[PDB]
């Protein structure tokens, strides 16, 4: 199943909900111990990790350096070592059982730093920084390379993407996207990096484009039904799901699913409540 953790509707949320694309049901589990939005979700060793984000509440607006681990059989959260810095609107990828925490903001500081967590030592350590400061950055791993895609540097929203090589600790700019995208959903479906939606500084986007490594080319595919930024995104059974987000007026509950063979989007699900800025992952 695909778990969504955190999110935001009037305040940051502690929801942990699981969607069944087979039954179409929603299964609700333990609350996050601290509410979080603008966080990222991943899975390592079947354990679900929630990374960074922020607690935007009626009494505060605290950027999170926290990393928290959910175990699907135990149904319980456990704190892990926290990152060097708080990272709101962070991006994360998984390579060789390690957690990469990418960019994000703390206050008005927009990070270019990246750090790496290893679950069996419970430690973070900094690696080479990106060439660009990026919050709202989409992150993906393909051929066990780490891609940071789009985002916002504090001033400009970005269509650039860069690649991190683990065995040299270096970042390389790649071909930029056709569209400037901050707060897009970025994943690796089959073997292209997919960037769906986001915000270009004036409009939320429903366009989706994908990066083909062999040709270093971005190509437009089926555009999403409903424009959305700050969306959750994951791949289930070889097809992509995008959950929630913001369209400039309302917090979406819509969940869309992309079939890569037909190249078609349409509405699969409502979340139990509309929200943006969730962390999504599958186990």
């Amino acid at each position: 199943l695909i778990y969504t953790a955190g999110g935001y509707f009037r305040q940051s949320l502690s929801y942990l909900e699981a969607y069944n694309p087979s039954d179409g049901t929603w299964l609700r589990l333990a609350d996050l111990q601290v509410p979080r939005s603008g966080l990222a979700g991943c899975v390592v060793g079947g354990l679900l990790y929630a990374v960074g984000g922020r607690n935007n509440s009626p009494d505060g607006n605290t950027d999170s350096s926290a990393l928290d681990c959910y175990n699907p059989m135990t149904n319980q959260w456990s704190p892990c070592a926290p990152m060097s810095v708080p990272r709101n609107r962070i991006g994360v990828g998984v390579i060789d059982g390690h957690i990469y925490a990418v960019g994000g903001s703390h206050g008005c500081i927009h990070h270019n730093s990246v750090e790496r967590y290893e679950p069996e030592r419970d430690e973070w350590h900094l690696v080479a920084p990106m060439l660009t400061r990026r919050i709202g950055v989409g992150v993906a791993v393909l051929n066990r390379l780490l891609y940071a895609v789009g985002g916002f540097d504090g001033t400009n929203r970005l269509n650039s993407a860069e690649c991190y090589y683990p065995e040299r600790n270096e970042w390389r700019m790649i071909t930029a996207m056709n569209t400037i995208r901050s707060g897009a959903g970025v994943c690796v479906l089959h073997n292209c990096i997919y960037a769906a939606g986001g915000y270009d500084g004036q409009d939320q986007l429903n366009s989706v484009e994908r990066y083909d490594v062999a040709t270093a080319t971005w190509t437009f595919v089926a555009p999403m039904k409903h424009r959305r930024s700050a969306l959750g995104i994951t791949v289930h059974q070889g097809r992509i799901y995008v959950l929630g987000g913001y369209d400039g007026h309302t917090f979406l509950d819509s969940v869309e699913c992309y079939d890569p063979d037909t190249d078609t989007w349409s509405e699969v699900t409502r979340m139990t409540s509309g929200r943006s800025g969730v962390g999504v992952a599958v186990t």
């Binding site: 935007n56 707060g183 700050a230 400039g248 917090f251 943006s276 800025g277």
Partner: peptide, 9 residues
């Protein structure tokens, strides 16, 4: 509201 995330300021 944040134009991108919807979150309050």
């Amino acid at each position: 509201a944040d134009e991108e995330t919807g979150e309050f300021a």
